[PDB]
Design a protein around this ligand. Structure first.
Ligand SMILES: [Cl-]
Length: 217
């Protein structure tokens, strides 16, 4: 019945680590970020006024959101359609902060996440405040951190690996800017639970992180 929480800022190796843990543990994998991104895609498709929280709420409420629970596959669904690729595109990336900010959007998705966490057997749940807000009684809580530079290196290498432009300076500026806005305009708690393992992954390979964590479970 193990519930595992994996939190931290983007580019720390968080998704690779969560899927790796889930793969190794024979657990379901719940990418909560993807769920916000799918909601965001529904909001964009609806034409909902992004300055109107009630319009955003309505469009996202109406969305039939599915995330694949299999760590070995990239699967995101909106009303049956495979949107895995699109939810990682520029439009969704740009809008997801606005959609995620709306309290009724979070309330809905948090409740779904809590229910999915008890569906049966093992589950690794990835996010920003899984350990502190969504699943405070999770059995294992992990918070991953790394320097801004290493987070940018990773995120830029991922862009390049996706045929996207190689622009480390721009990605670092973005990581820095989002760090700043997390500290002045956060939309949720963002720090490690007091009962979380805190891992600086700056000089470790994702496989080493997964392996060290497996040794502790
Ligand atoms: Cl992200």
């Amino acid at each position: 019945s193990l519930v595992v929480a994996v939190d931290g800022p983007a580019g720390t190796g968080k998704s690779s680590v969560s899927r790796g843990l889930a793969r190794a543990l024979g657990a379901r994998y719940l990418d909560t970020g993807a769920m916000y991104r799918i909601a965001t895609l529904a909001v964009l498709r609806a034409g909902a006024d992004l300055t109107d929280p009630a319009a955003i709420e309505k469009a996202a409420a109406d969305a039939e959101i599915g995330v694949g629970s299999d760590p070995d596959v990239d699967a995101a669904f909106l009303a049956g359609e495979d949107v895995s690729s699109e939810i990682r595109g520029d439009a969704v990336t740009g809008a997801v902060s606005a959609v995620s900010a709306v309290p009724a959007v979070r309330t809905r998705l948090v409740d779904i996440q809590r229910k999915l966490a008890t569906e049966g057997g093992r589950v690794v749940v990835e996010g920003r405040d899984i350990g502190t807000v969504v699943l405070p009684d999770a059995d294992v809580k992990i918070f991953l951190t790394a320097s801004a530079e290493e987070r940018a290196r990773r995120r830029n290498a991922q862009n390049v690996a996706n045929g996207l432009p190689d622009d480390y300076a721009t990605v670092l500026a973005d990581v820095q800017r989002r760090d700043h806005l997390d500290s002045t305009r956060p939309v949720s708690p963002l720090r490690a639970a007091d009962d979380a393992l805190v891992v600086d992954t700056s000089d470790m390979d994702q496989a080493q992180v997964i392996a060290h964590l497996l040794d502790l479970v």
